[PDB]
């Protein structure tokens, strides 16, 4: 192939194993945002990770936006730190991965009409809705977003090599349809 | 006002004449009677207004990419014009520092292309200070096209192609140990290629007629 | 006789022609020349964005401060 | 109109450096054929 | 045409459409405002002076050959 795909977003998910008051939370964390009226989660987000983490009365939370496994990591333990110095036994539990978003460009413009009617039966482009044609790869279970423009938006995945694999096996498949 | 139609009329009444002699235009005057054009009723203001608009036109019609009996009728255009106002400040043409740099060598062909009576009217339009040299054209706040075709492809053009062609071929019949066997690697050239500059060109020229040809 | 004439006659044949590219390439840069000008027509403030505060930001809608004169 | 005109003329000179261009590519491998003919021929004489 | 010149990629087929009837019906007796092509077309005048200034420099060679032109392709409306 030749082009590596960035990643852009990475939810990954975590158990504190201690339920939470989400008033107290939301009144004694710096940078937290907290509107049960229409959503019931506590929203932290942090500068140097640039991460954006939720956090549920359940004492599981949800942070998105590194783009790293590695630096996901560490924003759920920055997360984790700063409820556990709020006055609670926070806990690091089954830190584990559920999506990471990849993009990439393959600097081509693209016949979908050609693709479409190619792979009918994995594609589902319809421009009136969403102007990008939607892959959704089987082998590795990954829904790629394919632009007129050559932009590829890999996501789903649950590993990086998936998306790897994912877009090398679409990467020819795209180089057919170069317009 | 309209004015731009009787220019035009004036320029292709001289341009269908085909002349480059001033004697042509001074009938072409007489005839459409300019002398009348300034004269009316106007107290000064419509007055210099309109004639500085009828330089302003004149001028933009002496400039590329208009035809040459074009640009020369629009230089005879500019003097019967500028030399007939009621104003007492003449208007001046105003003539830009682009233009002028093309002006200078159109002055210096109509010299060398034997055309002497355009050349002495913009000799005398130039000694009788008739110009204003601005920076940009007209001010600032806030058409006889010219085909690049026949400057790609001429009569001499493919005249010399025809030649260079005949000249190849009567030398590769030479060249080579005979006369009769040119090798297979060595038959390559197109003898029709100039045909098919003519048709090219021809198919271009009728598809422009088609577009003046009205259905 | 010898090729070595028909390489010279080659050499000036290439010559004539390279400078009819010459001439046609210049053509075509002034032509796509004419284009990015008639573009940038296309994509080209009134004099109204420079009344009182004709230093307005573009961040926001209001002029400088107001000056010590 | 005036954009039309230069478009056309435009393609125009497209279509010739696209016919001129074959031919200097055709040129030039006469040209590479010559000098390897001439390289042989010569070399009949060295001997 | 313009779909297959490419002059509109990535476009919704009913805008490129919309677009479409709008530059024919400009060049005809019978002219249609954008708003009228929008409504029924569903697509917004913006929408389709978008469309429309993507195809309109290459106008005349999309009309047919055999058009009769109410309204010359040179003097197309301004957009």
């Not at chain 2, 090798?183 to 271009?204: C, G, P, T, Y």
């Amino acid at each position: 192939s030749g082009i590596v795909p960035q990643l852009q977003n990475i939810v990954s998910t975590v158990n504190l194993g201690c339920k939470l008051d989400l008033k107290t939370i939301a009144l004694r964390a710096r940078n937290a945002e907290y509107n049960p009226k229409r959503f019931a989660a506590v929203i932290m987000r942090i500068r140097e990770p640039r991460t954006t983490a939720l956090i549920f009365s359940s004492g599981k939370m949800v942070c998105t936006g590194a783009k790293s496994e590695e630096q996901s990591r560490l924003a759920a333990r920055k997360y984790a730190r700063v409820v556990q110095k709020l006055g609670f036994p926070a806990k690091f539990l089954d830190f584990k991965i559920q999506n990471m978003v990849g993009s990439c460009d393959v600097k081509f413009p693209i016949r979908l009409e050609g693709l479409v009617l190619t792979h009918q039966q994995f594609s589902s482009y319809e421009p009136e809705l969403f102007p990008g044609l939607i892959y959704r790869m089987i082998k590795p279970r990954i829904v790629l977003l394919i632009f007129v423009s050559g932009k590829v938006v890999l996501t789903g995945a649950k590993v990086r090599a998936e998306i790897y694999e994912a877009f090398e096996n679409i990467y020819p498949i795209l180089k057919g349809f170069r317009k | 006002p309209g004015l731009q139609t009787d220019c035009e009329a004036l320029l292709s009444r001289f341009q269908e004449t085909d002349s480059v002699r001033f004697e042509d235009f001074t009938e072409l005057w007489r005839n459409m009677k300019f002398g009348t054009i300034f004269c009316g009723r106007m107290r000064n203001l419509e007055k210099n207004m309109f004639t500085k608009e009828a330089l302003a036109l004149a001028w933009r019609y002496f400039l590329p990419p208009y035809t040459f009996q074009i640009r020369v009728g629009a230089l005879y255009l500019l003097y019967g014009l500028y030399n007939t106002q009621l104003c007492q400040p003449k208007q001046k043409i105003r003539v830009a520092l682009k233009d002028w740099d093309e002006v200078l060598k159109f002055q210096q062909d109509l010299v060398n292309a034997q055309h002497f009576d355009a050349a002495y009217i913009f000799r005398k339009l130039r000694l009788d200070r008739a110009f204003h040299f601005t920076a940009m054209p007209k001010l600032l706040s806030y058409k006889d096209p010219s085909d690049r075709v026949m400057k790609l492809i001429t009569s001499d053009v493919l005249e010399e192609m025809l030649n260079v062609h005949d000249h190849y071929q009567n030398m590769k019949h030479v060249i080579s140990v005979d006369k009769s066997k040119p090798d297979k690697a060595l038959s390559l050239i197109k003898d029709d290629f100039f045909d098919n500059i003519k048709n090219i060109v021809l198919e271009h020229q009728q598809w422009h007629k088609d577009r003046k040809n009205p259905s | 006789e010898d090729p070595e004439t028909c390489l010279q006659l080659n050499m000036v044949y290439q010559e004539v022609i390279q400078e009819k590219l010459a001439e046609a390439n210049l053509l075509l840069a002034q032509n796509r020349e004419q284009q990015e000008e008639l573009m940038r027509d296309l994509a080209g403030t009134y004099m109204g964005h420079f009344m009182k505060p004709y230093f307005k930001d573009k961040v926001t809608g209001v002029g400088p401060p107001a000056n010590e004169d | 109109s005036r954009l039309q005109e230069l478009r056309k003329e435009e393609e125009t000179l497209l279509r010739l450096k696209a016919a001129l261009h074959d031919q200097l590519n055709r040129l030039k491998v006469e040209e590479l054929a010559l000098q390897s003919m001439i390289s042989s021929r010569r070399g009949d004489e060295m001997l | 045409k313009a779909v297959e010149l490419d002059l509109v990629p990535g476009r919704s087929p009913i805008s490129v459409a919309a677009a479409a009837i709008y530059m024919a019906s400009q060049a005809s007796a019978e002219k249609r405002t954008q708003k009228e092509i929008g409504d029924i077309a569903g697509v917004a005048d913006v929408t389709i002076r978008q469309s429309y200034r993507l195809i309109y420099p290459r106008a005349p060679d999309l009309f047919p050959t055999d058009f009769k032109f109410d309204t010359p392709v040179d003097k197309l409306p301004q957009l």
